[model samples]
Target: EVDKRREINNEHPLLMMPLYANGEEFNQGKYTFWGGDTLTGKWENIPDDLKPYTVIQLHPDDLPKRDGAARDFYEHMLEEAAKYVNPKTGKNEPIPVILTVYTAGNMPYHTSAHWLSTSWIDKMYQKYPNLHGIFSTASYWIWANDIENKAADYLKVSAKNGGYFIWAEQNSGSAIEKAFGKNGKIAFQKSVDKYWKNLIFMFKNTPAAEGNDSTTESYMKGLWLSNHTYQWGGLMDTWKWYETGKWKLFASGNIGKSQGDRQWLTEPESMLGEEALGVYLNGGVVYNFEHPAYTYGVNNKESLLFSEVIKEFFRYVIAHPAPSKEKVLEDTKVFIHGDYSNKGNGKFFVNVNTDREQTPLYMTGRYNVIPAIPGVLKTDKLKESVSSSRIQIKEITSPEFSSTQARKEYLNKLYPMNYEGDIFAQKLDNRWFVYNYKVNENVKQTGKLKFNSLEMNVEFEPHTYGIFERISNGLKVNLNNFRTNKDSLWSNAQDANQAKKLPQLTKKGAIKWIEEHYIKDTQFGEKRVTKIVLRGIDKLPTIHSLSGTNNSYDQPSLNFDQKNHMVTITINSNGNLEFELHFLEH
Candidate 1:
């Protein structure tokens, strides 16, 4: 099923094979499917198509004793894989080989202990040029034993040998207990901070390895995936890792079957937001594990929502190119993340003001007093209402004004409060697009936000997060726009059960336009005609579609509802599709 999904979606799938068996199973010759001392005999068993995508999982128990066997098998596999040329690169590169240390820190095998040693792993990498990198499941024992230092050393060795290291952390069970010592129920915030601290330690110790040359590559310079608990509300930690560690890729795993009744599957927004952050950081998501055999069936509604989120994010990423470099702004009231284009332009920035109580105040004033009050006041209709003469007011000598309680009540009534959340700004060509996330459910956030030189009064509701394009006159906002959107467009499912049956378009990535026309170029994975409807577009548009290669014209089916200001375009064919529309009839 996994292989079929990957094939239909045109995705590069990682084949992880467990090569060793447990103590009792090994005596009965009951090893994992690909288990054996030699790969020559088992090599033919692997489907010819998947042979090049295999990663040999190394168990500590077998490693220390059969070191020679391991080396011989790896060498033989590499040599055999080199026979097949990579279609993408058109080079005779050995099928990319990755070594994953299964249960590295958790298992207690005295004889195999030496296998986890950095010196041994370093020697293995030095011996085989085809060895791409190493991966390990993070454990509490590893953290207690100071995995940061060892991981740093491993990272240096991998980079020196032209490889990468993947840090897979499952922050559950002993991992959480080790951090907070057998205690009562741990608060969610406490877990977040603890995970963050561990992340910080790893980032501080590890060397910043070079990122992948292209965004389309499967692996990155550095990769981090939080398996269980940390996957919830962990974007802050992920963003910090990306910035501090300079790791290009970030993902939160365990989407299908989670710890407690699969609660993570219910929160599609959080998952989508985190993946969106990954894309914004110039790295792509590793959409993992639609495991059909475990937990609820993979075709459930919750899983379908997850699939839809991934598709929406994929389209968004294709439309909006990631910045070449990104930096976190310093000394700001709110968390400000900035992205720069390859041309050294400030392409995008996001103001993450999760503080609900106080919004960052930026204004020109004589006094240096910048108080973080609950809210702001809009007093007069005139633009220049607060003149120097009008600002002066006589002090009230009444007891009501003097009392703290009375003054607090007066201030609360005077200034209307505004709930603040995260807001993002991206510049494409001449226009600036501003959007926000529905962080706080059902609540509306209204504030005058300033993103560097750009400033605007944003009023956002839970369902009103459609993209607002800035224009010469003012900002125009649209809401709940797109219709006839399908999840199958972004899904890898080949069966009817896993595909979404009904239209599931939401306000998540909707776009509103005030400009005369817009053009975007993106690649199509599967062969399908996707119809996208744009609301509040009254003018008729002259549509022109161009092939990615020859620049030939391929006309797209367009429908415009003049009375309702709605335009729908049906796009057909695959590969690279570029389309431009001109609102010439306006």
Candidate 2:
């Protein structure tokens, strides 16, 4: 219990410092503060022991030198970090988290290189504490046309002593347990259950008209923020496959979309195009989402909403390789809002564009928050990836608003929350479809066994022992000793002469041979059929119930012609009742 308590409790607060995505761009007026490039000489300068305690935010846009080498660096950097110990499975593998960086600054010149450039990120708390982890920043503020001087000035007298840093957690094992445990998942869910702001407002005039303006234009943050969350999930999604097979990703992307002209750089290759959705033929596939709104609804290049983008991204991945006609859905999720660095109590500097101490708290304000950190979990601190949603569904639905057929129809048509996206593989229909078992006596022993279940005495199950009925599971009753099993279920023979002598049997009424299993008491472990029809007719030979009887396999035969799609059940009994049930749809 103590160990469990240690393992299942998270939320240990940590001090967070404000920072930005990438901080290496050194030029002044020409680039956003985030455009500052981190020269290799800088990384080589950092000590080895400090590596784990350090993380870097590589802005998706800053990666101009895109090539196989860059892809390898991004992909293999955390190959061993994806699977931290699974709480249920109790396995540890360093839960990997991606720190993506982007920049948007309030400077035309004369400001920190990464200033204003860092406002694009959002803050969502850690969902699994192990899986999706991210940091955002709008850190640092500067004047127009002088980013280099401003960055150097801010770094000079700063208390944080501007430098690189990473999140080195103390007890990772316990953190994983807490994030994934039952109580942990529950607690984590409640944290993000509240409504989140998915819209970003863009105002043409910063100084509104006289009275408070009631109407304001809103746009979803483009691929910047939305992509941050999705890239984390999408990139992480492939970790399992990539690491397991050590599969070197050779040219992947949707030709119909992201593939466009970019194919010239990576050589010419055609993915499954923006085809039908699903796993049709699976070598593996990819999609390009560099556009403003990869999300289905409410997307704008000026502003991007995180929710719709992530919803669409997750849906797209689940619906991989497009035009999937099956009911797809998601039962789990991770939602986040605000910032990753605000949890700590520290003095934050809000840079005032007008150079005032207590500036108006509009979307932009007084030295609102200055400076940024790359690979910083709190670099920008507006949103963090800390919330998750679990898709909980069950097979056995309630018979609430419908009867059997209605229920069947409803189940067949219930569209899943997942699936539906751009670029999908040809679908393999087998996994998502199901067929019920066939049940009837006219079918062969093998046919009876193919069904869901069969009563013991009906005897159709191919390999089961039929002569003596199984009473105590391990113990079987001989035909003669059947009298001792359960309550006496009399199988009174029509020919009374067969009732040689009613021995002391475990029964109530007087009868000859006892029914093997009293199905009545079978419900409680307390009873088959008496042939009253045959008895009244004075039939001499008593036929054991159809189960134990040697029913000829020649009763009927059904052959399925899968190609032509037809079934032919030939009936052998002449002038006898023949009833066969076949697939209704087929």
Candidate 3:
């Protein structure tokens, strides 16, 4: 909350701060200030901080060095600081500033070096508390250039002196999460793991972006999920094999299409819903690159808009704080999965179905039934590494709308706000893409159970997904006899249409059984759990329901043996469902 009020909610993991204006260069000539209708006539564009503020870009020219004109520009900026309202945050806090140091130009010869030298820009922090952060061609070790070495040094000093910064590049987590894509493959797992090791090293002594504080926030500030934010899983999950809760994930940029040569840095409309929701559900923040046009229709440097559901989704996540620890579930357990983070501030989960056949997926173990279809392009490594469901899609979509206006017009006709649920279907490059999740049910379950494992009974249609965020949670019984619901399968894979079909669970139901053994923890008392139950049923409530013969839907009653320390119960559920599980000891 301190960060939010101070307008530096470092917990809002991903934030956007564009460092280029693409206008003119710097000079000692006439007083050519950057774009301004506010503060310095005089409003300097600050970090968007995950909001829709009219954030201005720094003139690449102004950063090199400044003359009396530049001094006036800087002073004017400071004076406006009091008056500059970050239309994004809506608070009159000092406007966040980014030193848009550039490539192609020499930092030492340009004004950037002058500002870094301590004469002109170093005092912005001592003078103003709003020196937000920085952006670069690449991150710390991979600034990818020799000329920017001094610029990078100045950035380190600035962050140490109280300025914030984020070095952008292709994120390893992004690559690993999408390991099931055309270019994704099994071996890429090793590549992504190597990235985790490198990331852990960066976190050891990293500083938070706000100041010289020693927190993961510094490490987070030090790295941004450069170029894209449209992958499915959480960054914390990507690197969980390394460590948990020590380093919080922070990033900028939403899912958008990369123009050219920069595709590695691109995210798409699918990620807008898929990625942002994960970030938000985990109490993360990101800035969608949509320029005022407010729709995915606007295409400029990976720019896209949010849907109504996603808009409300942001409200939900923003209200929650980033948890210190989040219990992550196995992606194999259920093609659909759930997690609890922010110490229970929110419950976040996701389920992505890349298959064309209907099958039941659990949230606890790997369901290795489907094999990768033959003839997919690269990154098939992503398939084995990504999800258990195997359905390969090689789409190449080209929006032939001639111009932005034509595309905008087409989008206006396609994207309707009110009726569409969370999981919206989209098409890209000649293939289909699944985005969004419909959270239909809310069941709060909190209890104690002893099983280093999990079991769920639900089915999913081809190419679908489900996402869950806990509103509140607090339950428990073991299942009886559970069996696979053969009726749940509607048709064979040959009859399915992968492109236009919406993934779903059968209208009928499924069942799960559990034989609880002795509590292994040697621990006593019930473990508390907080969860938000969500199902991927394309229809309404009657499609599925959960309850113990004992009236409690959340915490069912199982017949527990007094001496043997065991319990057995039958679990009945229709369609697919997801819930948060929090373990607590008394």
Candidate 4:
């Protein structure tokens, strides 16, 4: 499992876990927490099977009351958990640890009954050699404390010395229940609804220091993760800072499951999809926060299966790096989409699409992610932070899911097609009209290809995606078909049986959907596709008829016309197609 995860993301994104020995909370609370009582753990006993999580998370449970045997036991666990072997350096290094104060209790409060709570966070760095970071979050509790300020304190210490703080996407609905009981939870309900709006002001518009409000220098220097369940309320704003490399958000699965309060665990599989794409495509890192089943036990099948998909998604992004000069689709209509780019680095033209069922969105301006010349920039109405980035647009040119079977196999295990379009990618920080556009297609441009159609009809399924990438003059012409949509509405997993009801398509609507969602911008000017590689062509139900063009084909291979700068494609009767088009731009 570790090796498989390593395949996805070689970057050691840490998973902040708890230390619950069998004698203590591990077995004491039977099925009370997210995972059932069967779960077990130790300080030094980091599960190797839980891949990609090299960092061992230390919550409040690991610490004992400040005195005698309890303190000694707690201290001993810290010592053991600290010892680690560095796989890269081959040196005996300290184990990485993330101290989550929330696990102790809501921040800024001193506990009387739970003696070994909240206080030790700042001092733990000295206690353990590899105390990596701290999380001063509410988890599920009321978001009342000065958590950001406290977070700054940890950042200063870690920044000066050597460590980092990972911010949790704090949603207090369940946490409120966990910390203050139902009454407290009910009272904090409004705060929960307004968490995103409040947090956006707190982190972005609010200053780190005194009366200065605009500059969030503090937020720029920290790592953050979201608890944005509803339409990405606060996450869209925080994403601005993230884009500028001010700070990175930890993409993981904590806010969803394992909690008892709100129904995060029951969210659509596409929610995870949105989280993964948002992190990777925007040059962020992710830690697979597997809930409930903390340990890799077979009985906890729910956690295991859910986390498996998360693990794989990480691997894909890890394999492919995000591009620098990325262009997001503006004037959003239906399915959510964006470009995986880079100005100089021409890797692949990648697009991430989400939908409820086997759906397609419309609007024109055939978008492509090619390298842009020095002065000519892609016109993005959205804030530059969310819309553009002056970094290298990196991507995995050839991904494992490049084939048809690979996508189907994976999506089937997770979304199970037509249930809900994974048409994700929520609103932006500045405004929602960032990607809303109305453009005409150059229909006459591709009137003579092998199949004689600009749009390729690749069989894409529900909740799946196809990425078409190639480069020149470095400008890109990358096309994508949606196999997935981020349109999952209900938060409950059981309701997942109800697929997102996408409107039926007409020829014009389908073409418009193709254009609207297409990430088109040829800053490098006109380029010719030397080779067109169609994936899963053999797997199609039929090798005939395509949209936009009345072309029919009997075989997968088609001849290219260099003079016309076009190649006709064979459309197997699948909802979406997976293929690669290679071209030269410069």
TM-score order, best first, reads 4, 1, 3, 2
Clashes of each: 0, 102, 57, 88
Where model 1 places Cα greater than 4 Å from the true spot, the runs are 1-92, 102-114, 140-142, 168-274, 278-321, 326-538, 542-581, 584-586
Candidate 1 vs candidate 3: the lDDT winner is 1
Q: Report the number of backbone clashes for model 4.
A: 88
Give the least accurate 10-residue stretch of model 3, judged by summed lDDT.
510-519
Report the alpha-carbon TM-score of model 3 versus the true structure: 0.36
In terms of lDDT, which candidate is strongest?
1
1-586, model 4: which lDDT tens digit per residue? 0111121122443334443322244235322112222122322343344434545454444332333323344455566555545555777656555554433243224321133333554466656656655544323233444433343344445433344534444222322122112333332223322332112111111111111111111111111111111111111121111122211012122222122211212222322343344433433443434232322212323232133334444444444543222222232111111121211111111121211111112111121111111111122222234533333321222242344344334323432222112122122221110111111111111111112122232322222222333222111221221111212212233221221222223323322332343122201111112223222222212222323101211134564555444444433321222233343321
lDDT value for candidate 1?
Answer: 0.31
C-alpha positional error of residue 123 in candidate 3 after TM-score superposition, expressed in Å: 1.9
**What lDDT would each prediction earn against the true structure?**
0.31, 0.20, 0.27, 0.29
- lDDT string, candidate 1, 200-220, tens digits: 111110110111111101011
* Candidate 3 lDDT tens digits, 411-431: 344333221223333321121
TM-score of each: 0.39, 0.19, 0.36, 0.41
The better-scoring model by TM-score among 1 and 2 is 1
Best by TM-score: 4
